[PDB]
Amino acid sequence: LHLKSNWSDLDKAKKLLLAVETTVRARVTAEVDKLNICDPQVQVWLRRVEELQLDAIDEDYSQLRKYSCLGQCTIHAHRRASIGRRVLEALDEANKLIEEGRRFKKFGFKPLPKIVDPLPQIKTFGLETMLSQLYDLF
Amino acid sequence: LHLKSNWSDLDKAKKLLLAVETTVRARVTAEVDKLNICDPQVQVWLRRVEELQLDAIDEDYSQLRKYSCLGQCTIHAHRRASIGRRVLEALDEANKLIEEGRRFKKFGFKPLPKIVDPLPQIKTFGLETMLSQLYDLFEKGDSNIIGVWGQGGVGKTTLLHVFNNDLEKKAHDYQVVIFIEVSNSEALNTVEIQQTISERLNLPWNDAEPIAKRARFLIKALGRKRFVILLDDVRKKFCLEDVGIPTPDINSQSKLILTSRYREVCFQMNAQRSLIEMQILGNDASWELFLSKLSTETSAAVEPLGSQSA
Ligand SMILES: Nc1ncnc2c1ncn2[C@@H]1O[C@H](COP(=O)(O)OP(=O)(O)OP(=O)(O)O)[C@@H](O)[C@H]1O
Numbered sequence: 001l002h003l004k005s006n007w008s009d010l011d012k013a014k015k016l017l018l019a020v021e022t023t024v025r026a027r028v029t030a031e032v033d034k035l036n037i038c039d040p041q042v043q044v045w046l047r048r049v050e051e052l053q054l055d056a057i058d059e060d061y062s063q064l065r066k067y068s069c070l071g072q073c074t075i076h077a078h079r080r081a082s083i084g085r086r087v088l089e090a091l092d093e094a095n096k097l098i099e100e101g102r103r104f105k106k107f108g109f110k111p112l113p114k115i116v117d118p119l120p121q122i123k124t125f126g127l128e129t130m131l132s133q134l135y136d137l138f
Numbered sequence: 139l140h141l142k143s144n145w146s147d148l149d150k151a152k153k154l155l156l157a158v159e160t161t162v163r164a165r166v167t168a169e170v171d172k173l174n175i176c177d178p179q180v181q182v183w184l185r186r187v188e189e190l191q192l193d194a195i196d197e198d199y200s201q202l203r204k205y206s207c208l209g210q211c212t213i214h215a216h217r218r219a220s221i222g223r224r225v226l227e228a229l230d231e232a233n234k235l236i237e238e239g240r241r242f243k244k245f246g247f248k249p250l251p252k253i254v255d256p257l258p259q260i261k262t263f264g265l266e267t268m269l270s271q272l273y274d275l276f277e278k279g280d281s282n283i284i285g286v287w288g289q290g291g292v293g294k295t296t297l298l299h300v301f302n303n304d305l306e307k308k309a310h311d312y313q314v315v316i317f318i319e320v321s322n323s324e325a326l327n328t329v330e331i332q333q334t335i336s337e338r339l340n341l342p343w344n345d346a347e348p349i350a351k352r353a354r355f356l357i358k359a360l361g362r363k364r365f366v367i368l369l370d371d372v373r374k375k376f377c378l379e380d381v382g383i384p385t386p387d388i389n390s391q392s393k394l395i396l397t398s399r400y401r402e403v404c405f406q407m408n409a410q411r412s413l414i415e416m417q418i419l420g421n422d423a424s425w426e427l428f429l430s431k432l433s434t435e436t437s438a439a440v441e442p443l444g445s446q447s448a
Contacts, residue, residue, distance in 0.1 A: 026247060118358075
């Protein structure tokens with residue numbers, strides 16, 4: 001019976017993937033604090049991690065466990081194939097994401113300097129006319 | 139007969155796994171002592187080690203050893219398959235945990251700086267009214283710069299400490315609260331302030347970076363965060379952009395709180411309309427504070443009521 005072992009491996013992979021995602025997010029947040037934009041590859045990896053949605057197969061396996069009351073009954077044995085393929089797909093996808101996740105070394109890059117750098121914006125009075133004149137000559 | 143050899147290998151793996159877990163836990167404890175949070179991967183590994191529960195198969199094999207009286211009898215030979223699979227599963231799982239356990243090199247990481255940094259919480263008396271007033275201007279106030287003035291040593295620093303410590307009770311949208319002690323000099327020692335702000339924002343401090351470039355860097359850094367900076371006892375007018383603090387505007391949710399001994403310098407900070415005068419404590423508050431600084435051998439000589447003594 002490989003289904004239970006594979007689902008347990010999926011549980012371990014899910015926990016370890018949560019740990020890896022937490023570490024990566026912490027590093028990316030540290031880079032962001034330094035005025036740096038997140039690395040595009042790391043952003044794609046984060047998107048794939050967020051879109052994994054292991055909760056769906058978790059609830060699906062729970063629903064099957066509701067009917068896992070008799071192994072002998074086969075009325076519900078048809079959906080075992082769906083679980084058997086989806087759990088394996090989630091497992092090897094998670095393994096690929098883990099192997100990629102552990103490998104990043106850079107997590108950000110300095111963005112190109114902005115077109116305009118903000119300056120102090122102290123409240124002004126009656127400067128509209130001369131500002132318009134400056135725009136006119138500019 | 140591979141069962142006995144496999145169980146002996148499981149025993150060796152269990153002992154070596156206990157040793158590995160002890161070493162890893164020692165390293166994690168050392169990292170924790172350094173204010174560092176445990177590495178999530180190491181935490182998951184520790185959880186799996188704790189959830190291994192080799193004692194269960196140990197007792198199960200002992201129960202089988204009670205019936206291990208005859209190899210030939212099939213009465214208990216049925217459970218040999220269960221032992222044969224569970225022992226192997228425990229063995230190769232333990233081997234995987236060992237190979238992973240030996241490989242970690244980092245065991246912790248510096249956590250993100252807290253929303254509020256704790257400050258001394260010396261016991262206060264009769265500060266509730268002015269604390270409520272400070273909250274009123276901090277929340278309702280339409281001006282992002284709040285100025286407080288009063289006589290020297292009337293609790294301005296104490297009010298800032300208690301207010302900053304009380305901010306963690308209430309919920310707010312302010313990510314970072316910064317406490318700055320400007321009264322260290324009248325020459326505006328900018329390096330210490332920049333280091334404090336950089337430390338509070340998890341920024342990597344640099345030694346050879348010029349002051350003006352750092353000021354621009356912090357101005358950009360504070361430009362995306364709703365911050366609450368607490369200047370303490372400012373004594374001369376100084377440009378906020380010079381040190382790196384952006385002057386908050388109505389379009390931003392950041393609030394600036396400063397204290398001073400002089401009304402004029404507070405007026406110079408464009409905080410003329412978030413001004414509160416620090417009134418001295420009342421007679422009842424002064425009396426209840428006075429007892430807190432007296433020994434009972436003296437206090438029990440003064441505290442009791444009813445009987446009147448000089
Ligand atoms: N409500 C209070 N209850 C108890 N102690 C208080 C209270 N208010 C102030 N203090 C005491 O005042 C002492 C001096 O700090 P305080 O906050 O009064 O100074 P300050 O007004 O900031 O002074 P300065 O003008 O020199 O900067 C502290 O040691 C503190 O114990």
